[PDB]
Predict the 3D structure of the following.
Amino acid sequence: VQFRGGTTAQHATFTGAAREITVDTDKNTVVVHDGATAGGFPLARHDLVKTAFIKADKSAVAFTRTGNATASIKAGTIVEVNGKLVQFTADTAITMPALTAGTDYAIYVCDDGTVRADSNFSAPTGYTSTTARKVGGFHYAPGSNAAAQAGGNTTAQINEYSLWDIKFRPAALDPRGMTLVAGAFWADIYLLGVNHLTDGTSKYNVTIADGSASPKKSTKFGGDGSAAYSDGAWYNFAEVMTHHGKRLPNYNEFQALAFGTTEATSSGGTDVPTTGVNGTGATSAWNIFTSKWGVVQASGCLWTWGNEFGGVNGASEYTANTGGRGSVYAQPAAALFGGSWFYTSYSGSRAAYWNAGPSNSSANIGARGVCDHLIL
Amino acid sequence: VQFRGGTTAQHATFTGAAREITVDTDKNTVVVHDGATAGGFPLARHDLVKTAFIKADKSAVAFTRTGNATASIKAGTIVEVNGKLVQFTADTAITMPALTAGTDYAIYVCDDGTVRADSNFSAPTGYTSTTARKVGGFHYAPGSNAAAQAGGNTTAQINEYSLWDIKFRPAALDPRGMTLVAGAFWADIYLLGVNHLTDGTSKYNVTIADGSASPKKSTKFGGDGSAAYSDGAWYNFAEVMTHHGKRLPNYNEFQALAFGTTEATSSGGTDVPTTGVNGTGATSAWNIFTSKWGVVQASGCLWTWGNEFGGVNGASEYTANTGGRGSVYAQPAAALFGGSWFYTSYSGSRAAYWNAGPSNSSANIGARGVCDHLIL
Amino acid sequence: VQFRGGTTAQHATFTGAAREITVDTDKNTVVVHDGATAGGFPLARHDLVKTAFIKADKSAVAFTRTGNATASIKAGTIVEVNGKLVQFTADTAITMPALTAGTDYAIYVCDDGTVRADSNFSAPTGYTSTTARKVGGFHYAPGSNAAAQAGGNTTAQINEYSLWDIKFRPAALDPRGMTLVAGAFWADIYLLGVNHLTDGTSKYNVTIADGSASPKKSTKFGGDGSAAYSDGAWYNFAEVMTHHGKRLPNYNEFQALAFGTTEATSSGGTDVPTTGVNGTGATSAWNIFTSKWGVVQASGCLWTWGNEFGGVNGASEYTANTGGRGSVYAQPAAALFGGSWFYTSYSGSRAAYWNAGPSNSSANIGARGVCDHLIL
Ligand SMILES: [Mg+2]
């Protein structure tokens, strides 16, 4: 059966019989007719809905945490994948791989109707980037989120607030290793690492970047991928954050992200070298400082540079202390938030120090990234 | 009539006759043929366009204010609802319910082709959440926006700048009670209430939150829904704003949002207890302070905490004044904007005070929320 | 051929034969049947996919710069235009018009399958707003982006970082004359002009706005389109930026946007009157100050007001210096970034001055706009 067909021009002045189907040969689509409307009602070609992703509640993430090691895709989720419509009319279990503490996972809706997680961010085991579509993901944290204000535990589990989907995600360039804070903005779960170029800013069990072990110099700002900044100036950390489409936190962002930590408590010991891992001779284990949202070492471990200025000022003269990128006049301090290991009861979700110029560097100052929450 | 049909695999190597229609039984969709392209041209299933919402001008809101109590949906608006395509090829009147001063309304496009407003945010009277689709809304304000710089009147009317649609809206968690300022960002029409958990941050005719009547403690930050913060510290107000996905305003945001108010004028009297209502013994009625954008009590009523730091500093020693969440060192002031009732000619769209630490509290300091503008 | 058809109600309880097609007369669409599913599988009408725009990589711009005067649309780009599906399965050359230094261009995907640039932002030469769809654009800069930290050249060329598409763009009200900085945020290529109302904030070869030649007063804030602000206060510049949905830069934004400029170098001479053009008696040509991202006169030409406060404070008394919009108490300085022509080695990507109150005005202080990066 071949249908009556013509060009778009020919259709413009054609009115088919009621419930007649013609073919627009310019478009290669069907045109439905009502016996009244000239040009009829052309139908959409599938390619035009490619990548469609529809949720029942667009103001929440597409997935529900159902247990420490389990999660589900929500009822009402419709997904375009490999030319097919794949949907879920009930909360449907996500098929899990073996989960390892401190690893990010990607969630795929597959063209066979399954939904599955995997550590591979291209395609899940047994599928291709064609048969499996990445719709979101999560972080499998080394410990629980804080239930109150005494930090969390060390039972590896899905951090519910790290659940993201393609329409409910960090505005950062990459969504991995972030958690949603009060539904308002995303925070890096872990402090900035030295190897942020290959690891991203937020990674479990890596060397923390500070004054003594400066982060790798940004390849977007003349770095080569091997060189590190010569110190831990605010300037350098802010630059690394920008590389990744993130910011250093505001005061309001810091207090929100760090809530849940054990207040007025510090790591103790002599150092905090590694993310998600006890400090050197620490009197408090790392988990003492997990926030409500799953931000690891949220306070009392390393100060973070903040994105705020004020407090004590530098000299009222042109001082060339910017790494050779100009001079500053009456430069106010750049905020430091959280406290560090040496700071006993001074540390906490609101610990703030405003007596260090942005050109300052030390072994107990690093950084944490934040970014905007995107709902699409 | 049953058409030739096969699986997706079978179609991959099949080329139908020109203007032949086959059925892909794996997809359950039509495949159009051109007698040349192997696999033909599969058509989109309706479920894949579910929630589609298309506007002629994506850089403006979907509705036009046509009068004090009337509004229209714009020509060129196409809406998916209950499986149907519903569209408007001309500016079409929105069917209104009875409107009450200081109430938010939701706009629904219904599957019978009508568009209507309602105070119910689930479904409008006579419809269900299935037959009626919420596409946006507005605030019916207690008075007009400022025509110049002398505030507004007390004639209840639609605030044109409070018009929002699902693709032109506050980034806040909930869009209600906000107004779009210079097309740049959204501002809470009303000052933060004590009962922001059940009312949202911006509600007409409610008790204002300040140092003496602190807001309810955020349920996202260990609050139970009954307890209030023990004082009106910047810390507490910033926290409440975050709860709702909002911020305290910047200096640039404040001057923009408050423009239109009567400058160098204060409420007078002894207090401002209630939003959108005269202050206690006020010498100026509330409407004296409506901004160009419809921000109520924009200036001269209560100071708002700002999201900016600087000015006079606290001691250069570790001071534990954060509500038990750490210590601050050389803590600069948190900005206060707008002036309050006692401040005569000092109040205005640029009134700014930088001599109060974020741990300060008083009966004339509250907060106003802002957030980013979202165009999708 | 007229098909069996009925209303949506009638379909709800109808199960057609496998691979039968019926017509829903309420919807005017086809319903496919499987001989099992009551109501069958209704297909999408084309109008519901109107404006669809699909890219292979949603995290990058839709176009590639292929040379100084050439560019391509990327493989995998699917575009809805004038009822047709138009797509590109390989990187496809964009048809160029004659290009002029310092001009913005719009990219259209046309219903004949072509993709072309044009200086007209409504429709390209030989097409209409119906037959041609605007999907993005770019800036054809007066010179190259900085390869290192010695600025750029004067060979007119496409600035690769100024490439934007409808789903990868500034959050600003208008996308023109902006460049994407480290993939993180957008910066105005040029300093704010006096005639920003008709030119936008960022335009080549126009009079720069400063203390002596204040910008036009914003029509969104009581301006008439002819009047200028009486001086170059921070207040006025911040206001102009808001008009356009932009901000003055943060410190972190400024250092990012200006990287690539010749550091510790100033324009010299006695003035910088015009964007993208040598200063008056300048010892360094304008191109000495082009950033890595193509920000023109990024440093050492005119200070920009920043969106940050701190440093030296005004008096601890209520000072009415806000242009008659209230009083300020202990007002900290508003940041100035970049240096200017007189400032020799003090200028650079990190040059910052914190000793000028927001009410200050001078011939060497202007502004540059930034905004958020939008990925949709
Ligand atoms: Mg500040």
Q: What stands out?
A: The CA atoms of residues 38 and 202 of chain C lie 58 Å apart. The pocket of magnesium ion is lined by residues A 308-310; B 308-310; C 308-310 (CB under 6 Å). Chain C touches chain A through 69 residues (CB under 8 Å).
